[PDB]
Amino acid sequence: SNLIEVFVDGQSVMVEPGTTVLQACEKVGMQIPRFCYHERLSVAGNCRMCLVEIEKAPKVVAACAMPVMKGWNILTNSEKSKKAREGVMEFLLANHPLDCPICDQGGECDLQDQSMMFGSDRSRFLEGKRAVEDKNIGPLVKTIMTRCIQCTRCIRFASEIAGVDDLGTTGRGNDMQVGTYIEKMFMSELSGNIIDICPVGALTSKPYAFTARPWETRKTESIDVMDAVG
Amino acid sequence: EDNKQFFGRHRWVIYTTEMNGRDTFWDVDGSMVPPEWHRWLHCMTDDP
Amino acid sequence: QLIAVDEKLDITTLTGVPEEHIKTRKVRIFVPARNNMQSGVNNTKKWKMEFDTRERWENPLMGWSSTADPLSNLVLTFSTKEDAVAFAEKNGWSFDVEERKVPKPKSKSYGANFSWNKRTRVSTK
Amino acid sequence: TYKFVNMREPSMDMKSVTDRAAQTLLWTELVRGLGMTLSYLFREPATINYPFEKGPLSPRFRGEHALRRYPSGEERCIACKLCEAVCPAQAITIEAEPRADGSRRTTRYDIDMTKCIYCGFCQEACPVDAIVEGPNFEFSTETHEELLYNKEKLLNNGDKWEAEIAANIQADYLYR
Amino acid sequence: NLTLNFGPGVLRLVMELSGEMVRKCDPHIGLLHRGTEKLIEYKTYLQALPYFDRLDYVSMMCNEQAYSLAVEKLLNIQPPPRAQWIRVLFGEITRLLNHIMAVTTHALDIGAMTPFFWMFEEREKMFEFYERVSGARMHAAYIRPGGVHQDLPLGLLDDIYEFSKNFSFRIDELEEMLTNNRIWRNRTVDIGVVTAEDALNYGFSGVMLRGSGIQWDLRKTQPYDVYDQVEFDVPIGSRGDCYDRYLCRVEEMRQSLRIISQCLNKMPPGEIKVDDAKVSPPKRAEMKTSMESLIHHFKLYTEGYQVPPGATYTAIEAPKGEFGVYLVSDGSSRPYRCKIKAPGFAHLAGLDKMSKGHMLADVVAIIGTQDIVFGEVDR
Amino acid sequence: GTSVKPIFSRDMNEAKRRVRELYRAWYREVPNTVHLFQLDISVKQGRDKVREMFMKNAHVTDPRVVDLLVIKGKMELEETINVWKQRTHIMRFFHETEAPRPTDFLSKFYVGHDP
Amino acid sequence: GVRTSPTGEKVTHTGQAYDDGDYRRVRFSDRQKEVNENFAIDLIAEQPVSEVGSRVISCDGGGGALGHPRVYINLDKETKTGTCGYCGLQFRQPHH
Amino acid sequence: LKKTTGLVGLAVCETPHERLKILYTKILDVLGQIPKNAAYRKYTEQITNEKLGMVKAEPDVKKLEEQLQGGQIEEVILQAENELSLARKMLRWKPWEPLVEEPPANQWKWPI
Amino acid sequence: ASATRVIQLLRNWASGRDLQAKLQLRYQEISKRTQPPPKLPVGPSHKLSNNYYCTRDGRREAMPPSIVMSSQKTEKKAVTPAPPIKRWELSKDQPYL
Amino acid sequence: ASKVKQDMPPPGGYGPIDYKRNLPRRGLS
Amino acid sequence: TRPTIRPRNDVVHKQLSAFGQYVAEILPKYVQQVQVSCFNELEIFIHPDGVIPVLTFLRDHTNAQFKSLADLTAVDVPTRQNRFEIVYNLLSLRFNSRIRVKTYTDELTPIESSVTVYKAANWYEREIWDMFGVFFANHPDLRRILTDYGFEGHPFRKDFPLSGYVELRYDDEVKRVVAEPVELAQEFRKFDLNSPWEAFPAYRQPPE
Ligand code: SF4
């Protein structure tokens, strides 16, 4: 058809035009690291964690947002992409709080797992970290913004899926913060889903607070009965 | 203590004859030593 | 040197499982759903065979969680759904098979955010 | 390189043969073993006068468990459940919930001391030094039930042994 | 010909006797089968380390070392030099412990029973060494798959040297009691003779090989940690009987003392576990100041480290023979299969052949000379 | 097709022969087992138990499975002959300490949720 | 701050106490119920609130490597006081 | 002549050259009945011919020990009859034929 | 040891060695049970620069086993698994015990 | 400030350790 | 590769590969595959019918003479049609080398017993029969070796529950030790420790 031929680590694959590098890697069977990218949200390009090397290109490209071109060879395990991942995790973990034991997202954190898989095993940050004041957006979502990594996933979800434009970014530079800028409660019939999309423990469930750890829980796949959607 | 005895026999305790509520003239046991003297007696330190 | 006998394989009499742990259990063959707290997909690759949940009660002392079924923690891993079905069949367990759910391909476009005339234009980024 | 343990050849001259015969008839090696045992009788015994004297221990010694607390008086445990995740014997059971002031504290902390293998993994997984395995080893019991410790028992253990536990941690923490 | 059942380490033994001569010998084992290998599959690698202390429970750090070597081979990492030197030093100390236990319990079963006490004093001193380093008298869990858990305290090497410079006289006293005694000779000489071909075919290893004259030792042929560097001699018997294995074990105690001296002198400086915080946990201060170190501590103590898929068979020259582990890893943090090869299994299998045409009272001596501990035999 | 490798038999007739031989041996053994182990059961009860054990596997239609069960029963017989088992091992076949588990739907409904 | 149940049992810091009809109280007959007297919530409520003149203050629980992991606390909200997530100590900027 | 080879059960063989020659000749005769294209036959032919050359070209027995690189000519003889028995067994087995059958599709796939 | 001269002479004669030189009981020659703090040096990877983990990652360098002679797809000298083992030397410290 | 301090053998090493077998002959023909 | 990575030996890899060639060439009737891992472990995959022939050749050949049987075990992979994987580990003192021979089987197909080649295998094979239920033909005395007398089931199979089906206690009524269905005061806690985000890309499987 109108498919174009690209290479992932030297393996050929036929993809539709407009398909991004992340999706092309997905077809081969690789999951590119990500923090700001969600399939059902718009593309952001903020966290720079998906930076991958294209062969014969001097610059790394944001695989989440760059449409793939004919003839490209995506080097996902090259030295340059690995070094990019290490640097991005260094920056992500520089100002992050040492809250892993008290964080409700201990054993199910994308920051933790991706640090173990793609980042370095030590820090060279000899400064003092930052702390931002916590917000209150209702009795359902507990909010500890010191753990936020500014992926803006919650902002995009609220703007596009929930239809509620309460959440945003206030400030500039390192002093930018996610919130409502006023004492406001974020009420919607889909409010709790921002607990799921947040990769870090900045937004957690308030009723579920402190009660269990993910490795303990047994999972049972079942059906809803609260409404007729099922 | 007596530093001329070999290691193990160079420190000892004479238990009291009445601890909290029982007559301890004969019924002595090693759980009667308080933690600080427990640490000194079991040779975890040189400082009484 | 070869029997060339034709019959479905049934080893229930050799495994030593009690009678009521074969004809009363109902196993489930499924690809586990991705955890919604994380975006990784490495746990949704293989097929798992698990059993039906039985009663768990409270221990009168220490208030622990007591059970009376031995197969409460048995989870088996298979490459393909056919392998799992074959294992369950030869072991004599009635099973329910669920078909694998794959996230459909999606059309992502960064430029669509800054739309001239469509509603996809985002208010802020 | 290798050695021979039993590759000796007895000498067959008359003097050696007479020595062997005299050993056979007069039991020289038997008397020499008697002398060894006799010499060993006349030296000081190695027995210690338990319970008035104790065997030497170390700051690293593992013993009865305890739950520690800060100088203020607040317990250190924050229900991170790493001790329960790392326990090789599954002896720890933990349940937590937000306290009346929002603090992350346990409501259940049980150790089955008949399942514990006293490996110390729990005290080296804890990030806040809450669970420790203290110096006490003389806590034998007359019933099976008293060896199932709950949170009150472990907290009492900590408040009982805190002085020596803290001293041992001070002595040993620079090796960790 | 009658059938005797000597029931209740713990051993059951069914024998057909014609007079006093043993016509058939059949050991029934499984009285200490706890199911270690199946229980291991439900634990991570760190969680499964302590089982090896309990496997052969007279030589603990040797089992720890074998397991750590297998896991390191699958992980494609290597311990630091000081960790290897500490491993070899405590392995030789453990060899001393095991040989004392074996020889003195052999004598006790024969009926001597005095060297048992004489040398369990030294065994208690070595337990004190174990306790100082790890806080545990026997099940130390000190040797980990990345090095060793903790560094030596500042006075340990001096005490090890002080202990080890008098031990030769204790061995000499043991030899005075046992070596030349005619009753010991007549109990041990020409009893349980095994030929070199039968020893090789039956799967024997360790002293059981060298007692028959076979020149083999894994510390010399396939060295693992720092063994190639240290010089020692390998005692070789000539007759394949119990007396030659006795002499081999005593000379192994002496050579272990030699290696202990060398290890004490050649201790290097540096760190004790591999500087890779995705395998070995970071220090407490780093964990309490660094974000990466805290994340790695959390993940290593909750989930564990993933080991690349593959199967390996790693063997060491444990005091009782070749101790091996066949480890199969599926890429996760829990081992897929852990088979354990214990020399006691093969030796007890060969007991039936080795006790042919002997008195009923020689079965005791043969079981003693095999050095059978049923934790490793049954697992 | 579906060619498979024999263990002992070539068809089901030889498997039946082996089953009959094993039943012969077990029937011969029951009296000596009852007398030697000092069981409190009757030889009639032991032989009825042997019959019940043999009947449990009556629906097997595979010679490989059948002679594998025959090998297992022979192993058990050799255990009982050589007095490798004890009274406790032999007594287990009778479940004298287990409460009778009911079969009707109403009784099960009352005790708990277990079907 | 140990309390007492209407039946007479002591109330633990977790609030647990058997109700009147509960047979399990039989386990305490001729014996005692193991209760800690030092309640951590009351003991931490007695600590003073520190006053530091910075927007962000760091806490390690005291003792350095013998405390808890270091954390940083924002003190910009004047309505309340910043509380350490591990240690429970409270900090505050010098209002007025 | 030496005594006590050192391996229990391994006797001292006087006149070892003759026994080695006879055993290698028997090995070659049994090999002659193998198909010419079989790899086992050609490899064992090469090895046995080399060993016969070494034994025939060296009268001293110790120097023959260092040359043969097996040590203790007695166990060289032992390996000789082991190889002869293996040759007879292999002639009976006929393992040079093509593979009996391929394994199933994913019999040797790891992981899973 | 607090053993009289006569008892020492008797025990050394009965044993046949000098016993006070190597005693079985531990005395003041052992180390103190209270020691100075350690410093415990750090490992090789504690650098600040030129320390990227992708260059010192041992696990990620492990490879699947190399398949040789997949049945699914010259002079030819005979070969052995490894060169034959060398004979051991006879321990020129005590070749014979 | 402070330098490295860990368990190391003293300068020059430790004194020799006897390991050879020592069974003296009492002596009488 | 700085000091934290295990050193690599190319010479031994080449030698083991050459000997894999050699064994492959000599026995084409049975050998199905040959592999040499990165840590220099050589394993040969063969057909079940070649167990006696392959084992005899390794032991007796002048170039192999793997006279020692270090270990013999089995591995259970329920996803495979041939469920059980039989593993032989052999040691050669002459050339100071180790080899591995792998074979497959299922519940009802017996394997030829190698007690004739190695006297060591005898007890080993018994253990396999006790633990997995693999039958060995022509075994001198095949029976249970580790489990209790009368124990039903094979515990090391992957579908056997961890705590089994029965447990023992003492009954004063019948005045003897009895076995009853297993009930646990605290049930074993099953942990889901596996994480997403695959760790080793070199083992990534094709997406089929
Ligand atoms: S968000 Fe993740 S990395 Fe941050 S403290 Fe919580 S668990 Fe740790």
Ligand code: SF4
């Ligand atoms: S709160 Fe969570 S989802 Fe929202 S921007 Fe911060 S890290 Fe992203």
Ligand code: SF4
């Ligand atoms: S004792 Fe320590 S490790 Fe265990 S739950 Fe409490 S804080 Fe966590």
Ligand code: SF4
């Ligand atoms: S010492 Fe080991 S077994 Fe005991 S509670 Fe701690 S981690 Fe568990």
Ligand code: FES
């Ligand atoms: S995932 Fe692509 S930049 Fe964030």
Ligand SMILES: [Mg+2]
């Ligand atoms: Mg979240």
Ligand SMILES: [Zn+2]
């Ligand atoms: Zn604090």
